[PDB]
Structure formats: structure tokens, C-alpha cells
From a paper:
Previously, Winkelmann et al. reported another loss-of-function missense mutation of B. subtilis [name], named sor4, in which arginine 18 was changed into tryptophan (i.e., R18W32). The guanidium moiety of arginine 18 of one [name] subunit forms a salt bridge and a hydrogen bond with the carboxyl moiety of aspartate 59 and the backbone carbonyl of alanine 17, respectively, both being from the adjacent [name] subunit. Thus, our structural analysis suggests that a major reason for the change of the 8-mer into a 7-mer is that tryptophan 18 is unable to interact with Asp59 and Ala17 of the neighboring subunit and thereby can no longer support the subunit orientation required for the stable formation of ([name])8. An important consequence of the formation of ([name]-[name])7 is that the arginines 50 and 51, which are crucial for DNA-interaction in the wildtype protein (see above), show a different spacing and orientation in the 7-mer.
Bacillus subtilis can form structurally complex biofilms on solid or liquid surfaces, which requires expression of genes for matrix production. The transcription of these genes is activated by regulatory protein [name], which binds to poorly conserved, repetitive DNA regions but lacks obvious DNA-binding motifs or domains.
Residue numbers in the entry:
A (entry chain B), G (entry chain E): 2 to 78
B (entry chain A), D (entry chain G): 3 to 77
C (entry chain D): 4 to 77
E (entry chain F): 3 to 78
F (entry chain C): 4 to 78
Write the structure that this text describes.
């Protein structure tokens, strides 16, 4: 088990503060992203690639990753 | 143990769950629409029927296609 | 960690601030203040309210189960 | 030691108590009055006294009929 | 311990204290009047001389008759 | 607990949410949001920004070391 | 390891609540300091001396200390 998790391309997220990791497959989650981008709380760490996991933290930040949600929690190890 | 699979690969951190309840009551459908309004509704049912509603500490309301007991024992 | 408060509904113990009897407060005011801010959680499933669970983040959760028996389930 | 019975079956979680104080101070009587006004008051003193004022996080205020040192002793 | 006696039976949980400072300076007495107005002041001196100001996570300020480096000593 | 992010400045690892590369374009709004709002802490101390540390109090801290350097210095 | 850190002239700070400890060099912190001074979440534990470290806590308190930042951090233990 690691405190910080690689979410791709060197960007790190603390596991202690993750609320949820979800797929971008729905409409309510696209609104979560747009609401985040509007409030300046969106953190885009796909570095260009297709977004595959959406990380929501306590501080109401939304973090976009290029890896799969099962993979993210796995990288906790 | 820390991250819980609530259906279709969607993960939730057990450290932040306040409560898990049944969808089968009118007050709790109001909680769901109250969550869409403040932009705090996360739908993880992947299109299926809602069977557990997860309320986190950040006031997020998360919708799961899995029974509450199943979520509880997946800790 | 998780405590069954009746009818399958779970509350995480780590976030409960207080558990209070409906005879022992201006409960109707605490409850109606909770619905007003949209933080009322009804897990009585039609039965009578017998324990009121205040959590951090100001959620208020109605349970049909006796207060101290909820505590004993720790 | 986690949960405490402070009066008539009313429970408080020790991890969320900020301070247990004695009554008979002017500022705390405004804290009690402010919380009673603001809805965050929990009265466990069925009359007969008030000997401890319990302040938790999220400014919930709780009145108990036994001395603060006793309230702490129940840990 | 978990809870600290700060004078005359009044307790503070160590986990919620942010800072304990001397009363002897101008900036702190504005903190106190600020809290006294907004009703987040807790007076636990039982009338005696104010020698430490405790600032907790809920923005409460708690006045104690005991000295700051004594209050920290009662932790362990 | 306490990590040196360069030139004497410390950050407590328990309050970091994310550590991001200054490459990602949307963060530059994140930095200007903090700098304008007075929540920005610049510890690059003249040098070039190599990691952006975001904390729970919505503080944004600029550091001159790699995000991998910040996370690794935990140990 | 200890919970309370002596930051000068008897003033204590709980380590659990510290977010960051920084040098007074940066002109962005003077705005942070000066924001907190008028706003009334500033604590001045310098006892009149020159400011050597700025402690930023959870709940947005800004605590000014007269010792160096490495000094506050190493005095944890």
C-alpha cells in the first residue's frame, strides 16, 4: 500500500482523499466535470489521451485520469 | 477493504461513507433529486436499476446497482 | 465500522456525533431544519422514529431502533 | 470508550467533542442561546440541573446534568 | 491524554486544538474581542487571570488560567 | 509527515490531495485562481515550477521539484 | 514524536493541523499574511521579533513565528 498513486504521466493523487473513481459513461458525470471546469476545480491529467477514470476528492476537485478505475484502486496495492 | 467495488468497476472509498440506504422510499428520491441540483449526484448503476444509495461526507449522493448488504460486506 | 440501523440501512460509526431520543430534544426542529437544508435521511421505513443520528456534515438520520442498542452494535 | 451516555440514553461520540465546560459563564450562555436559536442544541438535562456543556464539531451544543470531570471519566 | 484539564474541570480535546498562545500581545486580544462578539468565545478561567488562549479547529477561542507550555505538558 | 519542497519550505503530506505537472494546461487557471484569490504559495524561490501541490484548504503551492520527488520524499 | 510544537516564546502549534511552513521571502505570502491580518485569522507569535516562518493551518489560520522553518519542522520529535 502506497499513500500516493500514479494516475498517469507522473501526476499523483493521495488515496486518503479520494471519494470515488467512476467511468465517464454517464450524463450526470459529464455535468460533474463541467461543474468542476466552471469552478476551476478540474484537474486534467490525461496529458492528451482519452479520459478513462474520473476521480472525485473531498475538496470537491475532479481529477481526470487516463487509466482504468479498477487500475487506479489497484495501484493502491 | 479501503476501496469498494459498487458495480461495473466504479469504486468508492469506505473511509468517506456516511450511510447506505434503500431507494424504496419517497424521502430518499427527494434526496436524489436534491443531489442533481447541487451537482452532487454520481450515477454508477451503469443504466441498471438503483438498489443502494451511498451518501458521502462531501455531500455526494452515489447510486449503486448493488444491494446495501452487498456493499456493506464488500468492505 | 458499519452499523445496521434497521431494514438494511447502514451508518458508519466514525461519523456519528450524537444519537438522541425523540423525547429528549426539540427534535421536530432539528429534523425540519435537516429537510430544509436537504440533509434528512429517513431509514424508519414507515415505523416510528426512536433514534435520531446526527453525523458530521450535518446529516440527520431517522432510525426505528432504540438509541443505546445502536451504540451496543459497535 | 468511543460513545458516551450523557443522560437518558443520549449518546455522544468522544472523537467529535471539542470541549466540556462548566456553566455559569456569560459567553457560553450565548453559545447555548445561539445554538438553541440555530437548531443545533441537544438538551439532555431533564430540568434538575445543568452541570456540563458539551460543544462538538459543527457547533452542536449538548447540555448534561453531571459534572465535566464525570463526563470525561466515562472514557 | 485525549482530553486535557485546562483549569477547574474544564476539558479540551487535544485533537481539536490548533494553537495555544500567550494573551500578552495586541493581535491576540483582537482575536478574543472578535470571538466575544460572534459568540465563539469560551471563558474557562472561572474568573482567574487569563494566561493562555486556545484556538480550536471550529474557530472557538478558549481562555484558560494556565500557562501555554503547561497546557502542552498535560498532554503526556 | 513534513516534506521539504525546496529552499526550506515544508508541506505536511497529510493535506496534499494531488501533485500535478505544470504541463497540464487547465492548472494554469488553477494557479491564477489561487494567485488572484490570495491562496497561492510560491516556493519556487525564483526557480522554475516543476510541481503544483494542491491541498485540502484549497491552497496551491508551487514547488521547484518533480511531482515524483514530492511524493517520494514522504519516506 | 510529539503533537505540540513550540514555535517560540511559549507559543505552541499542533502539528496535525499544519498545512505548510514557508519563508517570509515570497511576496505572495505577504498578501497571505496581510489578508489574514485585516481578516482576523492572524496569530502573531513573534513576540516583537522578525518573522522567520509562516505557519498555515487548516481553518485558514496564519501563524507567524520567529524561528526558522526547518526549526519548526524538526522540533516535531
Amino acid at each position: 500500500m502506497m499513500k500516493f498513486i500514479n494516475i498517469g504521466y507522473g501526476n499523483m493523487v493521495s488515496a486518503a482523499w479520494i471519494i470515488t473513481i467512476v467511468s465517464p459513461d454517464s450524463a450526470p458525470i459529464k455535468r460533474i466535470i463541467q461543474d468542476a471546469r466552471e469552478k476551476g476545480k478540474l484537474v486534467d491529467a490525461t496529458h492528451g489521451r482519452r479520459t478513462r477514470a474520473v476521480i472525485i476528492t473531498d475538496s470537491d476537485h475532479v481529477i481526470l485520469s487516463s487509466v482504468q478505475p479498477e487500475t487506479v484502486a489497484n495501484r493502491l496495492y
